């Protein structure tokens, strides 16, 4: 089935609606609302590529300079590397520089 509630019934279509919302808001001046509607896909990372949402949040939230989210993004960009190890290690070096 799906997530609880009629508002969360078509959770796959809702998942990609929120993902296309994130993609549109990343370049429409709503990068923080893109972060929130990709935190929507922090539940919906299973049906899409989890690395895509992870890198989206990490590399448009650290550059939004949300320092707690910067720390969490660099935790994800150093621990459990799903980010490819070139940029994973580059942002690991940034974590060793920033944090």
């Amino acid at each position: 089935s799906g997530e609880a509630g009629v508002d969360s019934a078509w959770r796959g279509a809702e998942a990609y609606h929120f993902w296309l919302l994130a993609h549109r808001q990343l370049y429409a001046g709503n990068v923080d609302l893109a972060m929130r509607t990709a935190l929507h896909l922090r539940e919906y990372e299973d049906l899409l590529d989890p690395v895509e949402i992870y890198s989206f949040l990490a590399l448009a939230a650290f550059y939004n300079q949300f320092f707690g989210q910067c720390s969490k993004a660099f935790i994800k960009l150093e621990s459990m590397p799903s980010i490819p190890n070139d940029k994973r290690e580059s942002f690991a070096d940034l974590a060793m520089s920033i944090f």
Partner: protein, 783 residues
């Protein structure tokens, strides 16, 4: 042996008209290299021959007779070893070397427990001799033959450390070195410590074995003492194959095949590494290399294991099954051979380590499982239960229950494998390794992080080993709580520090948890796992940590002290290149100290050290002939950049000349001299740099693109727009190149391939019309 054989033959011809036997003469024939016979069987036919012609002439003195029986003992040929050791025991019964070597001969002449009954008298007389090499190797060997490894490990490593201390007096691979380095006993220690793993692949990120790390460090030290010994590089890369350093073993085996004309054990190692690296066709290529060297190497457990699993990787079930059956049906792997066979056969039989035999049983079980349909054939289950039964409750085992643990992994019965793993309490077999096996299976195959951490819960419950709490840390790393990963890593470390891997894993969790202070504290608490030079770490690496913690004066102290370092044996000039590099990033620290003129002086002295390296680092992996002329070019580039920061482009001009003269082929040197000649107003000098680069490479982006624009400079825009349309074919929406080609075509009187490359910018990429440079370029196109 060729020159050795002819020198032996005309030697024995020359013995006729002189004294056919003489004491000092025949002692000096072999005794600096009759300390050892451990590399190749070619060492025996003169050393023991004229050891017999010297000691059966007269056995009175102890040095060469005892050490000749010792080198007779490094292929476990007690027969002659006990002969010379007992003629010594008849002549000088109690001694530093005589009785020690005699008990060494006993403890592989079937008398494993019969040479440990005179502890009090030997101990008091050994203390008297130390108060008023062979002793320490005796103690470690005797501790090993009884069954317990750890005391044998420690005392044998002490013996090889003493022989390395005796080795440190020599500047290189010397005959006197081989007397005092004594690779006989050291090689015996090494080959006695390769039994902890066998022919198996090994990883240190698993349950880490520090003993093979000690073997690797020791053989690296002996390679430093002698890069002219085939057993040095051979067993060094063999231990590398057992230390998780596989491609280093490949390179050292290639170094063997360089330094000796051929080596069958090197090809054994190469195919072993390839199948341990899971490279099947390369593995069978190196297997056929060993076969072309000798097909007679097939009947030995090391090559049995590696050839069997190569032909499993080669998927020749006939060949893999025949190798495994010759392991089984012909005795030697199915049956554990006795110690008395060492006297009879010499360098053919050693007591087969049980990891290796259980690996053979597991491999035969797996290939019969694959010969069946389900991964459980009757023969598969039979050999799984054999790998269980013959390897229960001992020290060299890997499968008390791990065999059907892995068989149930193949069946998918991970929980039955989990309770089978519950049957064993400690890593006498592969408790910890099957723990991480079924735990990672739960993590990824079953998508259960809870069972992934629960396996290590029950592992630390059964055996509280350091690797167990380490994998507690690994599963806490998985749970997106890297602080918990850290805390379980210090739990592992402060349970017992048994390896540098554990403490450095703690430091790495501190790195990924953004707590670098204790990370580099553990880097200064994981100094080195063994000897080999600790002040190199404690100075250069410590200065790097001070750079990480931002102490640049302390970095200058540690790193300027680092660049006076040294090694043992042959200290080759990598000492001096690391002095150069410590000076170069010392200059980088000076730049970080804001010392701009300090950067000029320190990086200029790094420039002149790399000018030495421009002439002294040319060979020894001779790509340095381009590397160092790039490096001194790049450091005079950075000093020219400092001159730009010192506001002088004419000094940048001079050091761009200097980079040009370091490396002519240097492409950004052509760029730099061209751009600061155009600053002087020299388009012709830029065209000359284009010509030189066109000689250096014919189709470069610089060469083709800027050649195109340089004849475009006289209104020949067709080549310019052609090379830039090649550029926007190669790079469709390169916004700088997009703007350049669209303005160039527009100024070429062309608006035709303008929207063609706008469309090509968005042809393969359906996100390009909303791009900012594409926005700007399409905008100016509409303008």
């Amino acid at each position: 042996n060729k020159q050795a054989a002819k020198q032996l033959q005309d030697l024995f011809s020359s013995m006729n008209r002189q004294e056919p036997k003489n004491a000092e003469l025949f002692f000096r024939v072999a005794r600096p290299f009759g300390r050892l016979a451990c590399s190749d069987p070619t060492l025996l036919g003169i050393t023991y021959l004229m050891a017999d012609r010297a000691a059966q002439l007269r056995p009175e003195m102890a040095a060469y007779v005892v050490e000749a029986a010792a080198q007779k003992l490094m292929m476990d040929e007690t027969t002659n070893a006990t002969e010379r050791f007992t003629q010594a025991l008849q002549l000088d019964e109690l001694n530093l070397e005589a009785n020690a070597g005699a008990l060494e001969a006993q403890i592989m002449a079937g008398e494993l427990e019969e040479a440990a009954g005179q502890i009090m008298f030997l101990e008091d007389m050994f203390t008297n001799a130390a108060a008023a090499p062979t002793l320490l190797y005796l103690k470690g060997l005797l501790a090993w033959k009884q069954g317990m490894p750890s005391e044998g490990l420690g005392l044998l490593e002490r013996s090889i450390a003493a022989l390395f201390s005796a080795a440190a007096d020599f500047h290189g691979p010397s005959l006197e070195l081989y007397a005092a380095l004594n690779p006989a006993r050291i090689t015996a220690v090494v080959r006695l410590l390769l039994q902890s793993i066998g022919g198996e692949p090994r990883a240190p990120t698993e349950a880490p074995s520090p003993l093979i790390s000690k073997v690797t460090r020791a053989l690296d030290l002996l390679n430093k003492q002698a890069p002219a010994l085939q057993e040095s590089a051979l067993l060094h890369a063999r231990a590398l194959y057992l230390n998780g350093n596989l491609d280093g073993a490949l390179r050292k085996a290639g170094e063997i095949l360089r330094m000796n004309p051929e080596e069958s054990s090197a090809h054994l190692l190469i195919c072993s590494v390839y199948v341990a690296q899971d490279k099947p066709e390369l593995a069978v290529s190196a297997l056929d290399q060993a076969v072309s060297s000798n097909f007679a190497i097939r009947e030995t457990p090391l090559y049995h294991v590696v050839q069997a699993k190569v032909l499993v990787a080669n998927n020749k079930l006939d060949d893999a099954k025949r190798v495994l059956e010759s392991a089984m049906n012909l005795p030697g792997v199915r049956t554990a051979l006795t110690v008395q066979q060492r006297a009879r056969l010499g360098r053919k039989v050693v007591e087969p380590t049980l990891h290796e035999r259980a690996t053979v049983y597991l491999l035969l079980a797996d290939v019969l499982a694959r010969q069946s349909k389900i991964p459980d054939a009757p023969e598969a289950k039979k050999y799984i239960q054999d790998a269980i039964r013959e390897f229960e409750g001992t020290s060299e085992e890997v499968r008390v229950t791990v065999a059907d643990c892995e068989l149930a992994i193949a069946r998918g019965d991970v929980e039955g494998a989990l309770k089978k793993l519950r049957r064993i309490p400690k890593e006498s077999p592969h408790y910890v390794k099957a723990r991480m096996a079924m735990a990672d299976i739960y993590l990824r195959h079953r998508k259960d992080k809870a069972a992934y951490i629960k396996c290590y819960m029950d592992l630390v419950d059964h055996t509280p080993d350091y690797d167990s709490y380490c994998m507690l840390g690994e599963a806490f790393m998985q749970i997106q709580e890297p602080e918990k990963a850290v805390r379980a890593f210090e739990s592992a470390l402060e349970f017992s520090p048994k390896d540098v891997d554990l403490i450095t894993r703690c430091a790495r969790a501190l790195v990924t948890s953004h707590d670098y202070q204790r990370a580099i504290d553990y880097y200064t608490k994981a100094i080195a796992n063994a000897r080999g030079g600790a002040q190199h770490a404690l100075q250069l690496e410590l200065g790097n940590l001070l750079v990480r913690l931002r102490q640049y004066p302390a970095a200058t102290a540690a790193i300027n002290k680092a660049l006076e370092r040294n090694r043992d044996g042959l200290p080759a000039t990598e000492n001096l290149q690391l002095d150069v590099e410590a000076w170069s990033m010392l200059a980088k620290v000076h730049k970080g100290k804001l010392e701009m003129e300090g950067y000029s002086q320190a990086q200029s002295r790094a420039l002149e050290l790399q000018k030495q390296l421009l002439l002294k680092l040319r060979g020894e992996l001779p790509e340095a002939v381009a590397l160092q002329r790039e490096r001194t070019a790049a450091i005079c580039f950075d000093l020219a950049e400092q001159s730009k920061r010192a506001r002088q482009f004419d000094r940048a001009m001079e050091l761009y000349m200097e980079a040009l003269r370091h490396h002519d082929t240097h492409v950004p040197s052509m760029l730099a001299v061209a751009k600061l000649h155009l600053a002087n107003g020299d388009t012709d000098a830029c065209q000359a740099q284009c010509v030189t680069l066109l000689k250096h490479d014919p189709d470069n982006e610089e060469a083709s693109i800027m050649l195109a624009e340089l004849m475009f400079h006289k209104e020949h825009y067709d080549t310019a727009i052609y090379h830039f349309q090649q550029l926007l074919e190669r790079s469709p929406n390169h916004y700088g190149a997009l703007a350049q080609l669209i303005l160039l075509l527009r100024r070429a009187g062309r608006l035709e391939d303008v929207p063609r490359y706008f469309a090509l910018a968005e042809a393969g990429s359906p996100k390009a019309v909303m791009d900012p440079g594409y926005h700007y370029c399409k905008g100016i196109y509409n303008r």
